[PDB]
Each structure stands twice: as structure tokens, then as C-alpha cells.
Design a protein around this ligand. Structure first.
Ligand SMILES: O=C(O)CNC(=O)C(=O)O
Ligand SMILES: [Mg+2]
Ligand code: NI
Ligand SMILES: [Zn+2]
Length: 331
């Protein structure tokens, strides 16, 4: 078995290997990359996502989200308070302000210490989940707006044609902006490209151990667990690396820098934080190996998780017994 300790693997594809996206994912899996739940891909030196980032300031962030924490430094939830619209240039100025900017630090490990010590005492503002793309249309390799769709994959594997669409999303971050512990909708893959700015630190639990994280979470968030049998689908709970280690939960960590891709694998729980002003693009995707995970994915039906239009067909075809209850949660 390849990668039996479930370490995060880093890949350096050549320009020739960067042509065929599906083939390269399958290659990474042949080497055991999926066992970690997360892999890093450093693009060939010849590649670029677009020519420059000099002209992005007028993108609108219609609903910036202030991430307000509750709990203790290593075990907390966050809620999202909606703020007034602002442009990317306005948001960048805000991220760089004395109130929000990255503190002085020695290295990524010092900054990570400072994040976990101090996160809960601040409420950073995240421009998340903005439909759109920063890849140039002429970028032919690893262009996250030009990937094979999940609907087409399901149709190819299973023969059933379904409604729905699959487009990327932009994320504008600042110091301390946080992504809570989660797997993707329907335990899909994700791919995330850090277009510009400061790094993103990731934490990940191997897919084979995801239920250990779920059992800890039920213990640490006992009210939430009574409310919903899949409350991590709400994407609000944070648990620090120190608390994971104290409870024997297997995990790994890695920092993504500008110009790098990350892939999350089916049922790989992940969480993390941004170091300072940045912009990332991400999208879900599927492969043949996903189908069995999609069939077994948990679902929130309490009403909290509310998701896209396109998840309806995935539930309906892959999980017909659960469909009626899940759809009630949607309505
Ligand atoms: O970058 C973020 O805020 C969160 N991203 C992801 O969870 C992802 O790409 O799967
Ligand atoms: Mg612009
Ligand atoms: Ni994710
Ligand atoms: Zn729920």
C-alpha cells in the first residue's frame, strides 16, 4: 500500500504531465496521495494562471462576512455576520489596516502559534464564496473554470443524465480568516489555487480516520451534535492542532503559498486559516473513485447546511432513500 502513514505529498509535474488533468489526479492516487486527504501541486515553471493581477480591484464582494468566534482558544465555533458590500480594492485596504493586518512574526510556525492563541479575540472579515474566475481563458492547463463537470462524470459512470452546473468560486482573505472543519458537499474532491498574496495554512485528517474526528467533534460540541447528526456540514466548528494531539486524532498540516494548488480528496476533513490579504479560487470535482464516497456521504437534514441547486440531483440519484428527508431540510 502506497503512503501508509497518510502523509501530505507534494508533486512537481512537468509541463507535459500538466496537460491531462484527470490523468495526473489518477497518477497522484497511484502514489497514495489520497490517503492524506490533501496534496500540494506546484505547477511547472513555464505555467501561469494569467498575465498579471494588476486589474482586479473593481471585483465586488457583495456580502463580506465577519467571522465572530465563541468558545475557548482551541475549541470554538464561528458565525458569519453579513457586512456591507465592498470592492476588492476596498477590502485589500481594510486587510492592510492596523486593526486587521498580520502581526510581526518570525516564520510560519510563530504565526501559527499566534493564530491559535489569539484568533477568538478578533473578528476578521472574509470575502468568500464569490462566483467567478481569475484564470485567463487562454490558460489551457489546470484552468479551474474549464474542468470536466461533476454532472458529466456521473453521466459517464452511471448512465444517467442530470440537471446542474459546476462553476468556480473566489475567496478574498485576510489575517485570521478561518475555514472550519469540513468535508466537501457529497464528499467530492476540491481543488484550490492560491492566485496571489499571503499564505493559507491547512490541517487535514486522513479519510480512513474521518470518523475519529467526527466522534471528537460530537464530544466537544455536544449541543450541536444533539441538533444534527451531521453538524460538521454547517461549517462552523474549529478544533486546534493541540487539542487534536491531546485526543489522539491523526492529522497533518501544510502551508500553501501563492502560485500553488491544493487538492482535497473525498472524505478528507480539512480546516485552516489565511496569513494575510490573499485571493484563492476553488471548485469541486469528481472522478470514478468518488462515486462510492458520494453514495455513503452524510447528510444534514436539520436545515442549517443549505447548499447549491446542483446537489439535489446527486442526492436524488446516489442516495434515493435519504432524498425526501434531505429535501425537507432544503425547504
Ligand atoms: O480557502 C478556503 O477558505 C476554504 N477552501 C476549501 O475548503 C477548499 O478549497 O476545499
Ligand atoms: Mg477589477
Ligand atoms: Ni473545502
Ligand atoms: Zn444540520
Amino acid at each position: 500500500a502506497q503512503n501508509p502513514n497518510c502523509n501530505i505529498m507534494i508533486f512537481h509535474p512537468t509541463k507535459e504531465e500538466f496537460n491531462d488533468f484527470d490523468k495526473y489526479i489518477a497518477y497522484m492516487e497511484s502514489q497514495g496521495a489520497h490517503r492524506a486527504g490533501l496534496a500540494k501541486i506546484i505547477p511547472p515553471k513555464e505555467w501561469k494562471a494569467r498575465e498579471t493581477y494588476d486589474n482586479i480591484s473593481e471585483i465586488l464582494i457583495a456580502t463580506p462576512l465577519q467571522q465572530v468566534a465563541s468558545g475557548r482558544a482551541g475549541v470554538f465555533t464561528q458565525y458569519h455576520k453579513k457586512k456591507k458590500a465592498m470592492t476588492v480594492g476596498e477590502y485589500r485596504h481594510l486587510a492592510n489596516s492596523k486593526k486587521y493586518q498580520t502581526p510581526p512574526h518570525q516564520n510560519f510556525e510563530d504565526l501559527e502559534r499566534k493564530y491559535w492563541k489569539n484568533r477568538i479575540y478578533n473578528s476578521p472579515i472574509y470575502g468568500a464564496d464569490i462566483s467567478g474566475s481569475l484564470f485567463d481563458e487562454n490558460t489551457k492547463q489546470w484552468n479551474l473554470g474549464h474542468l470536466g463537470t461533476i454532472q458529466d462524470l456521473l453521466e459517464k459512470e452511471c448512465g444517467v443524465v442530470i440537471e446542474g452546473v459546476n462553476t468556480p468560486y473566489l475567496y478574498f482573505g485576510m489575517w485570521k480568516t478561518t475555514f472550519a472543519w469540513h468535508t466537501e458537499d457529497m464528499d467530492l474532491y476540491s481543488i484550490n489555487y492560491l492566485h496571489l498574496g499571503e499564505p493559507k495554512t491547512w490541517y487535514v485528517v486522513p479519510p480512513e480516520h474521518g470518523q475519529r474526528l467526527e466522534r471528537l467533534a460530537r464530544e466537544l460540541f455536544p449541543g450541536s451534535s444533539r441538533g444534527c447528526g451531521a453538524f460538521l456540514r454547517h461549517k462552523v466548528a474549529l478544533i486546534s492542532p493541540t487539542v487534536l494531539k491531546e485526543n489522539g486524532i491523526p492529522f497533518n498540516r501544510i502551508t500553501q503559498e501563492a502560485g500553488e494548488f491544493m487538492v482535497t480528496f473525498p472524505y478528507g476533513y480539512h480546516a485552516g486559516f489565511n496569513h494575510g490579504f490573499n485571493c484563492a479560487e476553488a471548485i469541486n470535482f469528481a472522478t470514478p473513485r468518488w462515486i462510492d464516497y458520494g453514495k455513503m456521504a452524510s447528510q444534514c437534514s436539520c436545515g442549517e447546511a443549505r447548499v447549491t441547486f446542483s446537489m439535489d440531483a446527486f442526492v436524488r440519484i446516489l442516495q434515493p432513500e435519504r432524498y425526501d428527508l434531505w429535501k425537507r431540510g432544503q425547504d
